[PDB]
């Protein structure tokens, strides 16, 4: 009945995530502390055990969704994944907040005692930010109105969930023990933080001019974030209080992309290597081709998500004639193959 | 069991004029089912799925490639539409009808979507792309088996392949300025589109309106640029299920011969292109022409053969009869 | 050889006036329906296109009249249903299977004679999809008719076990 440690869970994620050290510590410590809180259940000397949610921040295609999915594999309690862009303020045409709890029970097979001990994740949280700039009569619903509904959910209270797909029977489900991991790529947040921190100068002659912001520093700038910086973005102070912990994820570097195709077991290189291993054929991928693929990805400003297009576009012809081909034991791909000038060398 | 070369020939029998698209679907479907025969038991655990994205004009045979492929492969297949807040559960239950409410057999089925560009730029517009993201990656949806037990069956969405079909409008202008040349308005500046679509990339799709997260799930790309005029004639002659052969077979049991000269088929190509609808707007041209002939053919006696001329399509003349 | 397209148009002219083009279309589809069932799927042409009818016209144009006048001239039974009272999931309003039940009453429970029957529906616009305001009178009803039109078998209690009655051979208007 031994629970996993923060070091053990961190090593498990290293085999599926690359280039994110500070964020791994938060999820490991939070998930570790989560098991302890639910396990004790105000039975030990420690009475009224609190809760601490997590707020992930990082650019697009940085790996936020990856940590949420890979973590659920080793996680014992259930896990779900939703989006807040479709939520509405209790009555509009779009959606209801309790739909999140409905998807949670599907993973737990309608086990209330087991669902309360589960974990929940939210994606695209930046879309919830104030839209109208200190709103007017329009009564923003997609924005501010959504945060107010979540306030009680994140803190803890009973709710109502349809049993088998309704919209006259509702079951109560507490949420004080349920954890939430909100995350969404924020747009323009770097500008807001930079403008606030690095400026103490007027435009006139007498005012002194502070020399700062020499480099962009996207990774090091988000580290200096604070709740007041988010208020200018559009978030409410009450909502930020429900999410005390913060995590800053750095963008992807060129060399980082090479590691993603070699270190993790789910790398596409290992997938295609195993795709031909069943056929009794070997595969190879030289460094001359991997570094070039990273340049094509950054050139297209698509990131690691749009990386399969570069691989499948090259091996399209080879995969077509490979099944019919016989007496072929190994295939070698070169940098020229990625450009398309040459064809991958085949070993008979 | 099949091979890319074997499936290419079968597709060729019912489809023509699209050579590059055949190799794309062949290797894709081949490796897709390979993962089902052998899953995570090999060293390459958690083999990811490769979705497919078709790009071509309307009536360019986008639906036939998915529909005909489904017939060849003994697996279920349904047809979805981008018009149908989430409204994503209807697509799952729609597939179980053909599969007789089977979990494993349905999971290996394929699904097709039409008018995928209609949502690019609200819960029915851009809100649909965001919802599909999880569907095109893997999830489970409740589906009442038989309609009703008070229970539901779980059907993963990682094994089911998706083919997002559609026709992008104005995409040619986006790629021209980015790759070929910035022109169209100047004097020296240059004032088929198919060749341009081959050089398409995901970066151009972002300016079109699509979401990069949505495009990342579909690395495969297909270019059903256009259909040739002769191909239309071949479409009515090479496929065994051609409409020309249907009417020919319709009158065979009646004991009357039918004919279709080449000088009459070329006119149908002009009316088809004039409507900018492709092969879908073909029966309207045929059924509207043969309506007069079919109306009085049973009444007429001692007629063994019928000939349709080019003038007949226009309607100015009457189809020649043979006694 | 009871039906003649040249004669069927002459008979409708007695009871209907002002629609010459529409009368020609019905004579072709109606004649093609029985011409097909005379030799079912035995010809060389495989995957033959299904023959159905879609009447579209303004008010008082005679849509409902053609359905009634046709049945009188015709021998096979006829039914006149409506999409306004149809519901889904066995609700209190009505079920799609009721259309098959009424057909047998006209045919006196003759499956061989019922498969060659005609079907007519009015106010098809009512089942048109609408944005969410549950909506039972909509897409759900269309799905039942779609699987029913594409050809299937539906349970029918004989005389009020159940009987299976194919529908790929039954016409729909
Ligand atoms: N650190 C990483 N290591 C390996 N693969 C990664 C990493 N980060 C991103 N990826 C790849 O990018 C894909 C998408 O990751 P996501 O977590 O969705 O990125 P993202 O920043 O969350 O984008 P969003 O959620 O739309 S803002 C993953 O399935 C991986 O293939
Ligand atoms: N072509 C016609 N010739 C003669 N009388 C007609 C014609 N069409 C309609 N009528 C008259 O209108 C009455 C109703 O005809 P209907 O077929 O119900 O018209 P309708 O347009 O089909 O109505 P709906 O909207 O389809 S229920 C008939 O009983 C006739 O008196
Ligand atoms: N290359 C082709 N060969 C044979 N038939 C074709 C071809 N392209 C289109 N068709 C015809 O077009 C019809 C399907 O059109 P569809 O693909 O649904 O149009 P859209 O893609 O605009 O929905 C089929 O009946 C098919 O016979």
Coordinates of C-alpha atoms in Angstrom, one line a residue, chain B residues 233 260-269 308-313:
Chain B
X233 CA -17.1 10.6 -70.1
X260 CA -25.0 7.1 -76.0
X261 CA -22.7 8.6 -78.6
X262 CA -19.5 10.5 -77.6
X263 CA -20.8 13.7 -79.2
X264 CA -23.7 13.7 -76.7
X265 CA -21.6 13.1 -73.5
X266 CA -19.2 16.0 -74.0
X267 CA -22.2 18.4 -73.8
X268 CA -23.0 17.0 -70.3
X269 CA -19.5 18.0 -69.2
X308 CA -29.4 10.3 -78.2
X309 CA -27.7 13.1 -80.1
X310 CA -26.0 16.2 -78.8
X311 CA -29.0 18.3 -79.7
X312 CA -31.2 16.1 -77.5
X313 CA -29.3 17.4 -74.4

